[PDB]
Symmetry: none
Subunit: 217 residues, 10 copies
């Protein structure tokens, strides 16, 4: 049975997007919050219709379609997709993902009936990635320096944000974050990381080490 999202939460999220913008970490946290339960294409479509303006909504429709197409390519590349089935009769077409298939157009109840939970979570992750792309597009990691007065956790937050919300492949983010911790992060912390008796091979480990041995001031 389909239950709609509260218009009160949607109104609060819309005003959050209106005042803070699309890219603020609080806005992305709120979107992740309202993106907790797997939503039907109807829900996400109406949500983006309400919270986004017309032009960002067009951009988001484009990006969502592209991400869903990548998902369907991965699905035809692996018959063990949680949206797919074992036989060929359960293969998931883009009409079923975008809610355009038969028995789904405009009807959220029938949508919730025929859709799979794997389908729902794939649609939801696709919509979240598309929202991230459009937010990064509507309004550079290698230009980030730790200010003379800035703390280290703020610098790490800013750097990880800019590196993960960029055009790098997923397998190239951790080495870049590490090598940016080592070369940025003004020479006191640079020497603190350099003289590490242990080898730090993860951004979390570097952050923990620096937070332990940092110069309290």
């Amino acid at each position: 049975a389909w239950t709609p999202l509260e218009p009160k939460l949607i109104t609060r999220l819309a005003d959050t997007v209106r005042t803070k913008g699309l890219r603020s970490p609080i806005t992305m946290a709120e979107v992740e919050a309202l993106m907790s339960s797997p939503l039907l294409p109807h829900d996400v479509t109406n949500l983006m219709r309400v919270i986004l303006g017309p032009a960002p909504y067009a951009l988001w429709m484009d990006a969502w379609g592209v991400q869903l197409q990548t998902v369907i390519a991965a699905a035809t590349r692996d018959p063990r997709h949680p949206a797919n089935g074992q036989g060929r009769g359960e293969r998931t077409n883009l009409n079923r993902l975008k809610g355009l298939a038969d028995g789904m157009v405009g009807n959220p109840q029938g949508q919730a009936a025929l859709l799979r939970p794997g389908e729902l979570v794939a649609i939801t992750a696709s919509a979240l990635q598309a929202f991230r792309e459009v937010a990064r597009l509507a309004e550079p990691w290698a230009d980030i320096m730790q200010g003379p007065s800035e703390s280290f956790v703020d610098f790490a937050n800013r750097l990880i944000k800019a590196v993960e919300g960029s055009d790098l492949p997923p397998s190239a983010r951790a080495p870049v974050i590490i090598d940016c911790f080592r070369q940025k992060s003004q020479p006191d912390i640079q020497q603190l990381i350099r003289t590490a008796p242990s080898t730090l091979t993860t951004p979390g480990e570097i952050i923990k080490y620096v937070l332990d041995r940092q110069k309290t001031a």
Copy 2:
């Protein structure tokens, strides 16, 4: 059957962490509240992704891994773990605890299917201890 946590509660908890910080007793009480029912690795992972910033989230992933490794050492030190079974075929690997095992990666429904209640409570206690460590470390 898997039911997600309310995004309203998650938004309220995120704003609590944003205003009060990670170490306030009210924040730890709220986390204990949202840590009441045994959560699947998917739930806790997304929860920490939403409520924590990027750097605290990295620290928390590290600490959670370490605590889960201690749990798995205690599990191989005692075949009577509520996550383990009696035979050797029920021994619980870290891929099954972190949600990385087969049939679980990215799918919360399959996760809830294959996981044990002892597995869930162990994962939950590990995540709570890791949150405590990171909160004590961040400030």
Copy 3:
């Protein structure tokens, strides 16, 4: 009225696109005629700097979102 919408001399492009998409989708056109109309209104409205920017597109833009992305990339920062 959608056919009377022009991009003002001082107006940005995202505001013009928002206004145009709003007026086109909230009108009496069939659903299958909105995207071509939005594209052809981007091409003929949207004062001649952006008109020439869209005209000299080495790729073929076949969607309002793609046109918006291209224009936002290559727009004259001012």
Copy 4:
């Protein structure tokens, strides 16, 4: 003479292409050397706006007809 043909500052591109193809095909070149010469004359003549338009072609144009189509699509309406 084909090697003396330039696109005038005010001349359109289809007139220039007509004149150039006429002078190249009605000349002393072998039949198998007309298309490469027409292409390389499109690239080096055809005043620098169209020169840069052909240079920045995401696709590789390997025929005078394809070059003409591309330029007619992405030309600066004026």
Copy 5:
């Protein structure tokens, strides 16, 4: 036996294209008139060489090739094409459609000998569609 089109009709059609343009309905009607009987690749090629300028002729060669390629894709998608035969030995290659096959290059008599009527009508329809495309593109 191959019979050429009258140079008087071709001259009148060329002057029509010169004064009225490529896109006028009278010009398209005249082209449809001179496109009544199924023409051999030689005929259509020389006709477009005479009535069209150099640049429109290049565009038309491109468009004609593309349309013939679509026709050959439909032909390999259906063995019952009026240009095809039942066995695999009658499959029609683009060298036979564009007049480039063996025994046809430059010779209209041999062309008319080896070509099928279905081949001729397909070539003719392809050339007409290509002319329409180029006319819509030129102005």
Copy 6:
């Protein structure tokens, strides 16, 4: 039979290192030239003794030892090393690699007798990597910009040099080089790469595309 390297070539290489430095691309090319045939530990040791000063020579001995130790760890991790044999009696100890084993200390003829060609090429590659490390150490990729008047091949050469001669892991160099091509390389080439109808997933492909469609000037 062992043949020594010409002292004329060694003198020319030493003067090259003296005038151009350790890190110039011409110096590295000359070292690669004199590093063409597989050298015995005696040859490389004397070569580095002659061309390098005392302190760079100490640094190079350290780095060479570390790289040889990594090689021996990989060798004990794979019994199919071209330096190893099939049985356990052919396992290669560091005394045999550094030329310290029995029948080799100070004698290049005996060295050439007992050493394997795989041993020689491994020693040579180790010495080359150690030279690169010491050269990078004796005298920043994220600060490299394409100058307003600089050509693109010079910028690409400089960037690839600084990225490969840095502290990044080997699996993180290509994504970093690509993302630096995209964000550096002044906005004309930035837009040229952005509007690529094909997806460029390799620095070589990006370089080829840009060289094809660049604005001749």
Copy 7:
């Protein structure tokens, strides 16, 4: 038995490429000179690593791969390739041409052992054509 090229000749060729450029006829003549005997993938790879800069070396790796792929397509189109054999067990894979096959990675002696003379001359001609392409492309 594998014999390396003289570093003196390689240094002279590198300085020739440095002063005259990639496209001068003297440079191509010198490359043809050092491309006289059939080289192993190790030799050509190190030679191009030394004489070419980083970006031309990337371009050359790309072009060499493409040309070797064309060679392997011609090889699967003709079982009488001097690199191939008569039976199917001698078919030459790109791992064997690029030196990536088993028993060849990093070892020039084993390379020279398993490689065929036809393989060597095909690799050499491919590398020469790739060098020509990159030289025509760089300037």
Copy 8:
């Protein structure tokens, strides 16, 4: 009183450690609470040069003797 002991600007570190360990062991604390108190007093007293020297310890020092040895090794000779 142990909680009032500071390392003077001119005092050496071994004298400060002697005084602090004396005052902590000759006090009313339980025996199981002396080592943590001595460590945390080394870290917060012992004027900021030695404070930063102990803070930036690549190893974890978990004993007053180890802290004393480390500081005596890496101290600023003056």
Copy 9:
């Protein structure tokens, strides 16, 4: 004589290290006594700024190359 080598007030550290390693390796010491002597000469020569820089090393340096690398990293640029 190696035991008479001092780092001059204006001399850089790499020149001093070169001179010292040269004089120590080209002397009458056994081969197994050169590294400890070079280290202990780095520590006691090499005027008190670098002396204190080596003294306050959070890590233990057990090789002339490691000492040289550390000093080159943390040296006072001047």
Copy 10:
């Protein structure tokens, strides 16, 4: 039966350490003198408590623990240790060496009862080596 060391000798040794220092050869000779008969952990512990200051005493406790751990590693590496026995029930734990085992904590009489002569001489040699280390470290 346990007999304590004379407080007169201990006072003289303490004043020797106070005037001559920890590293003088006369001080080491005096320590060797008072280290002649195998001492119980109680004796050596109180001796070092009296003759050494607080910080050298902490250093000495550390060094003594490390040396005793090396001894116990050698003991588990050889079942023929004069402190060990033949069966596994006589294996000597660090609680028995440091005097922390059951029936020994604070009681020198029970200590002397349960301890072996090999245990005593090993403890004594360990304490002497630890004293040497701390003396070399303090100045």
